[PDB]
């Protein structure tokens, strides 16, 4: 469960802190109310757990909060859930990294001045880790569970209305990672659905225990959220006095928050694939296992997290309502979808599932409404992003539908080709030119070599050296008055294409891609051919073949 429960188990490092921050606007003595609200949050958690249990039972293939919110409501709610899951992933990496840096700064207060630099550094190291592709993502979660359990144990040993709703919303903001198991069902044992339901029940129990313990410890110690450190940090400090175990707790908390960010990065492509299978995201994302869109997606979430951690300054309190909205819109849409699927169907336990999902959906909608009407000064990014991202999804869907309409219809075959002319541009006669012209002669005749010379005498010397060469292909030296390569070439191209069309031939070009095993010679070599392809050979409907001449 660890590799998937990272998000939810790490949420306790800031759930109680958010509750206390919202309850600190009244007075310190109001911290009493942090005890009921917490269990109230747990109540919602119950519903969510129960609700999502049904989802793993409902969709063994693994749908999370998108398939449920698309197959049940319709196109627009499904795309809204998808866009909100995307913003949930961006906020997951942002908030998890911000809280990890805040925990580190709590451990080492001298670093507190450099909060956003270490934050962007952590984002960048996670980006690099997820760009170059385990059991190293399961030890930190178990360490965090053990450390927090023993911290709760020793804390108990030592110990032995609108604003309330705002606190309830900001505390439910500690329930964000529950979607991970519903998204990653297909990664389980032989009974995937039952095993995933069991492990999500274990996740719910463990998260409830951790959150309740942290809240009761915060109540007992009478702690308050200092801008310098988290509430869990204060609990550990007041329980163990900044000893080795306190530093262990801080390091493990930071590690699990980094791990939660990593889970956000590694679970975004699951959303991208679920969307691109429905023609809403680019087809590059359809090949999930080959990691095609993985690099682009990691780049995008890394840059978005950087932007949302610099604009918001790394203060997790100012980013947590954005995260709560981004994770609770999919919650509401998913629970509403489960409710609608239940009412449309007639299963045996119809009434119980009805009531549970309806209660959960109402609670989640109430929470997100409060987040809207309370922290709008930090939730307006949702109101500017969801329209943009959903309109982008719909634009992609419209484009793919138009392409399908203009492509599925097979029509009359084109006119029969009676041969090809292969223009083989040459810089200087080398082994690469010899190989390319040999292959061109293999493909067809009329192998027209062309050299766009920049000097008349050099042109004559090159033509003489060509006449020395034994290849029997006609070569055309085009003189360019200034150091140009496109205009003479495209003039010759127009002439040769007109001649080929009159003789009914298909124009083809060879561009030997000189490849050297050094990974930085690509800027040096064959960078004058990408010019030709981009400029005058992808606008003419002309085949442009590349011969990978390797270097040794």
Ligand X SMILES: Nc1ncnc2c1ncn2[C@@H]1O[C@@H]2COP(=O)(O)O[C@H]3[C@@H](O)[C@H](n4cnc5c(N)ncnc54)O[C@@H]3COP(=O)(O)O[C@H]2[C@H]1O
Q: Residues 498 to 517: which contact its own copies by CB under 8 A?
A: 506, 508, 513, 515
Q: Counting contacts by CB under 8 A, is residue 405 touching its own copies? A: no
Structure tokens at 25: 């606007």
Helix (H) or strand (E) holding 450: strand 447-453
Q: Are β-strands 506-510 and 475-479 bridged in parallel, bridged antiparallel, or unpaired?
A: unpaired
Comparing CB distances to ligand X, the nearer of 58 and 529 is 529
The contacts of residue 175 (CB under 8 Å, 6+ apart) are 8, 11, 15, 41, 44, 45, 48, 207, 327
Contact partner, 434, from ligand X, its own copies, none, Cβ < 5-8 Å per class: its own copies
Give me the least distance between CB of 433 and ligand X, in Å please. 5
**Residue 320 interface partner, choices its own copies, ligand X, none, CB cut-off 5-8 Å depending on type:** none
Contact status: 32 vs its own copies (CB under 8 A): no
Going by C-beta distance under 8 Å and a sequence separation of 6 or more, which residues neighbour residue 457? none
Residues that bind ligand X (CB under 6 A): 283, 400, 403-404, 407, 425-428, 430, 432-433, 436, 450-452, 485, 511-512, 514, 525-529
Tokens linked to 272: 């991208």
Of 284, 354, 366, 389, the residue at the interface with its own copies (CB under 8 A) is 284
290 binds its own copies (CB under 8 A): yes
Choose among its own copies, ligand X, none what residue 537 binds, the Cβ cut-off being 5 to 8 Å by kind.
its own copies
Which of residues 299 and 403 has its CB atom nearest to ligand X in the complex?
A: 403
485 binds its own copies (CB under 8 A): yes
Q: Toward its own copies, which CB reaches closer, 208 or 437? A: 437
Binding at 425: pick from its own copies, ligand X, none (beta carbon under 5-8 Å per type)? ligand X
Half-sphere CA count of 474, side-chain side, radius 13 A? 9
Query: Residue 113 annotated as binding?
Result: no
- Collapsed DSSP state (helix, strand, coil) of residue 354: helix
Q: Which is nearer to its own copies, 33 or 466 (CB)?
A: 466
195 lies in the binding site for its own copies (CB under 8 A)? no
Answer for which of 136, 348, 417, 472 binds its own copies (CB under 8 A) is 417
59 scored as a contact of its own copies (CB under 8 A):
no
Please say whether the beta carbons of 235 and 214 come within 8 A: yes
Does residue 167 come out as left (phi exceeding 0), alpha (psi in the -120 to 50 range) or beta?
alpha
User: What is d(CA 483, CA 76) in angstroms, rounded to the nearest whole number?
Assistant: 55
Q: Which residues contact 369 (CB under 8 A, 6 or more apart)?
A: none
Q: Which is nearer to its own copies, 356 or 421 (CB)?
A: 421
Rounded Cα distance between 65 and 331, Å, is 7
Q: Return the number of other C-beta atoms located less than 10 Å from residue 146's C-beta.
A: 11
**Residue 455 is labelled as binding a ligand:** no
Contact predicate 165/172, CB 8 Å? no
Indicate if the alpha-carbon torsion angle 325, 326, 329, 332 is positive or negative.
negative
Burial (CB count within 10 angstroms: exposed 0-12, middle 13-18, buried 19+), residue 102: buried
In the block, residue with structure tokens 């988290």: 230
Q: Is 290 annotated as a binding residue?
A: no
Q: Site for its own copies (CB under 8 A): which residue of 400, 459, 478, 490?
A: 400
Least spacing, CB of residue 83 vs its own copies, in Å: 17
Residue 14 known to bind ligand: yes
528 binds its own copies (CB under 8 A): yes
Task: Dig out the tokens for 510 from the structure.
Answer: 């060879």
Q: Which stretch binds its own copies (CB under 8 A): 16-24, 113-121, 228-236, 417-425?
A: 417-425
531 binds its own copies (CB under 8 A): yes
Q: Residues 423-462 vs its own copies: string with x where CB under 8 A? A: -----xxxxx-xx--xx--xxx---------x--------
Q: Which residues are annotated as a binding site?
A: 7, 14, 88, 96
Q: Which residues are annotated as a binding site for K(+)?
A: 7, 14, 88, 96
């Amino acid at each position: 469960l660890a590799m998937l429960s990272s998000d939810a188990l790490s949420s306790v490092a800031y759930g109680t802190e958010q509750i206390l921050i919202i309850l600190a606007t009244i007075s310190a003595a109001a911290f009493w109310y942090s005890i009921p609200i917490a269990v109230g949050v747990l109540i919602l958690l119950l519903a969510l757990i129960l609700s999502y249990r049904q989802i793993i039972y409902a969709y063994p293939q693994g749908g999370g909060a998108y398939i449920v919110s698309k197959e049940n409501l319709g196109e627009k709610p499904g795309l809204i859930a998808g866009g909100s899951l995307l913003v949930d992933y961006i906020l997951t990496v942002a908030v998890s990294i911000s809280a990890g840096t805040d925990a580190i700064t709590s451990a080492f207060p001298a670093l507190h001045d450099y909060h956003v630099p270490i934050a962007i550094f952590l984002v960048l190291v996670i980006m690099i880790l997820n760009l170059r592709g385990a059991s190293i993502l399961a030890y930190p979660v178990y360490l965090f569970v053990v450390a927090l359990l023993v911290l709760i144990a020793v804390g108990l040993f030592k110990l032995m209305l609108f604003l309330l709703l705002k606190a309830f919303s900001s505390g439910c903001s500690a329930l964000t990672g529950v979607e991970a198991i519903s998204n990653a069902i297909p990664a389980f044992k032989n009974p995937p659905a039952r095993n995933a339901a069991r492990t999500l029940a274990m996740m719910g129990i463990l998260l409830a225990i951790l959150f309740s313990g942290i809240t009761v410890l915060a109540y007992g110690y009478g702690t308050a959220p200092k801008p310098d450190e988290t509430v869990v940090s204060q609990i550990a400090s007041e329980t163990f006095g900044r000893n080795v175990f306190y530093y262990v707790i801080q390091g493990v908390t930071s590690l699990i928050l980094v791990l939660a960010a990593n889970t956000g990065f590694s679970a975004f492509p699951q959303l991208a694939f679920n969307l691109a299978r429905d023609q809403y995201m680019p087809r590059m994302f359809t090949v999930r296992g080959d990691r095609l869109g993985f690099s682009n997606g990691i780049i995008f979430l890394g840059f978005a997290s950087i932007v949302l951690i610099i604009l918001f300054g790394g203060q997790t309190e100012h980013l947590i309502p954005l995260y709560a909205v981004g994770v609770f819109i999919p919650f509401t849409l998913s629970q509403t979808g489960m409710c609608m699927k239940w009412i449309k169907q007639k299963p045996k336990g119809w009434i119980g599932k009805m009531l549970i999902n309806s209660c959960g959906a109402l609670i989640s909608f109430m929470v997100l409404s409060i987040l809207f009407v309370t922290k709008f000064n930090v939730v307006w990014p949702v109101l500017i992003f969801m329209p943009i991202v959903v309109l982008l999804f719909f634009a992609i869907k419209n484009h793919y539908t138009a392409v399908g309409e203009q492509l599925r219809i097979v029509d009359k075959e084109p006119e029969e080709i009676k041969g090809t002319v292969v223009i083989v541009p040459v810089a200087g006669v080398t082994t690469v030119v010899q190989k390319s012209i040999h292959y061109a002669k293999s493909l067809s005749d009329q192998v027209i070599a062309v050299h766009v010379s920049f000097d008349r005498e050099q042109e004559k010397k090159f033509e003489k050296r060509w006449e020395e060469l034994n290849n029997g292909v006609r070569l055309v030296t085009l003189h360019s008055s200034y150091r140009s390569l496109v205009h003479p070439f495209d003039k010759f191209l127009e002439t040769v294409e007109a001649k080929a069309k009159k003789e009914q031939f298909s124009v083809m070009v060879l561009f030997p891609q000189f490849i050297t095993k050094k990974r930085w010679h690509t800027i040096l070599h064959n960078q004058s051919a990408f010019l030709l392809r981009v400029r005058l050979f992808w606008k003419k409907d002309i085949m442009v073949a590349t011969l990978p001449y390797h270097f040794k």
